[PDB]
């Protein structure tokens, strides 16, 4: 029962690796103690270099086992 | 010591080949310009020399390693069981002998 420490990373850019080998490039926007980091301006990155802007991805920590930083925040 | 034991081994090698009671390979070694300190019978080493001679004889009997070799030992645990039981029977008779001798002396 403890929220996660995305606190200075919020409203900033992360490039995330979720299951299916997929990537979500986006802004940290919203979460729950369930770690469900929700990315707006988030775009998919497939196996091939194809990428689609998804509008607002509420990407559950159910799969996303990685995400790297674009800046220092 | 290893040197004295080697000298006793040479004494056994000479007692295996001494073919006459007055002629051998050690009659020369006794008074032939060298030391001969195992040649004494009044030395206690004479007894170890006699044991080494018994060993050389156990190697010099034709059934002991000259030209015939029996495999009832090299592949024989049944004859080995027979021999164990034979040693044990000799031991039982000997225990009886010791008990009877102790009783008689007492």
């Amino acid at each position: 029962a403890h929220p996660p420490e995305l606190k200075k990373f919020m409203d900033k850019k992360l490039s995330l690796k979720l299951n299916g080998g997929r990537h979500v490039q986006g802004i940290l926007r919203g979460f729950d103690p369930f770690m469900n980091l929700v990315i707006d301006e988030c775009v998919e990155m497939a196996t091939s270099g194809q990428q689609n802007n998804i509008g607002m991805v509420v990407i559950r920590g159910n799969s996303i086992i990685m995400l790297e930083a674009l800046e220092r925040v | 010591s290893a040197f004295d034991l080697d000298v006793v081994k040479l004494t056994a090698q000479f007692v295996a080949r001494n073919g006459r009671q007055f002629l051998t390979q050690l009659m020369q070694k006794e008074q032939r310009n060298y030391q001969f300190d195992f040649l004494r019978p009044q030395h206690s080493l004479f007894n170890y020399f006699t044991k080494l001679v018994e060993q050389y004889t156990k190697i010099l009997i034709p059934p002991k390693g000259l030209f015939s070799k029996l495999k009832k030992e090299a592949e024989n645990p049944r004859e080995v069981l027979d021999q164990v039981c034979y040693r044990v029977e000799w031991a039982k008779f000997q225990e009886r002998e010791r008990k009877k001798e102790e009783e008689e002396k007492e």
Binding site: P4, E5, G61, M66, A69 | -
Partner: protein, 83 residues
């Protein structure tokens, strides 16, 4: 209750560690912020993605749910957990 595993994770956070994840995503770097739920924040890390092009990123959020293991300070072998 509270895990000496979590005490080990707290002694392994803050400096260079090397986490290893499910599909081979292994990040060797400053495992800055790890919470007892193990969602490890690494900093200035070199992560392989099992891809052998083990490239260096910054401030990654490597979850611990996929974490196969985590190489920690070799200096705390005399931990207070085991002692």
């Amino acid at each position: 209750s509270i895990g000496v595993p979590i005490k080990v994770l707290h002694e392994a956070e803050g400096h260079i560690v090397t986490c290893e994840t499910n599909t081979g995503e292994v990040y060797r770097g400053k495992l800055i912020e790890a919470e007892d739920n193990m969602n490890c924040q690494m900093s200035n890390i070199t992560v392989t993605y099992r891809d052998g092009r083990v490239a260096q990123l910054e401030q990654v959020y490597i979850r611990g749910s996929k974490i196969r293991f985590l190489i920690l300070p070799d200096m705390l072998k005399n931990a207070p957990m085991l002692k």
